[PDB]
Amino acid sequence: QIAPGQTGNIADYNYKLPDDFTGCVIAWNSNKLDSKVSGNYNYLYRLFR
Amino acid sequence: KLQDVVNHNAQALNTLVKQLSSKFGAISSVLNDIFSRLDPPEAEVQIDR
User: Fold this and answer.
1) Region annotation Immunodominant HLA epitope recognized by the CD8+: residue ranges (chain A)?
2) Which of A4, A36, A47, B48 is close enough to A21 for a disulfide, judged by CB 3.0 to 4.6 Å?
3) Which candidate, B48, B3, B1, places its Cα nearest to that of B27?
4) In Å, what is the CA distance from A36 to each residue of A3, A45, A46, B2, B29?
5) Which backbone phi and psi does A38 adopt, to 5 degrees?
6) A8 at the B interface (CB within 8 A)?
7) What is the distance between the alpha carbons of residues B38 and A37, in angstroms, rounded to a whole number?
8) Closest approach of B38 to chain A, Cα-based (Å)
9) CB-CB contact of B14 with B6 (8 Å)
10) Residue A38 DSSP one-character state
């Protein structure tokens, strides 16, 4: 969903890239330090702006 | 010839104004639809065409 110019809840409400963006994107899942049996609720997001 | 010159000029102007409606194999023939109905990164090619 996150991309230069793409619309969405994160784009409209969180870190949004500009139309003319140059760089590289790296993605990977790290359950080593993010998996909590009770829930790793500290990773928060905003959905009302 | 006096009629011919004026007729040629009128025909040239009419052709020039008529060729505006051509889409040139693009999404639409007006700028607002291109700018509002598509992502700008992939609308740049259409507007440039």
Assistant:
1) 40-48
2) A4
3) B48
4) 29, 17, 21, 90, 54
5) -90, -5
6) no
7) 42
8) 10
9) no
10) S
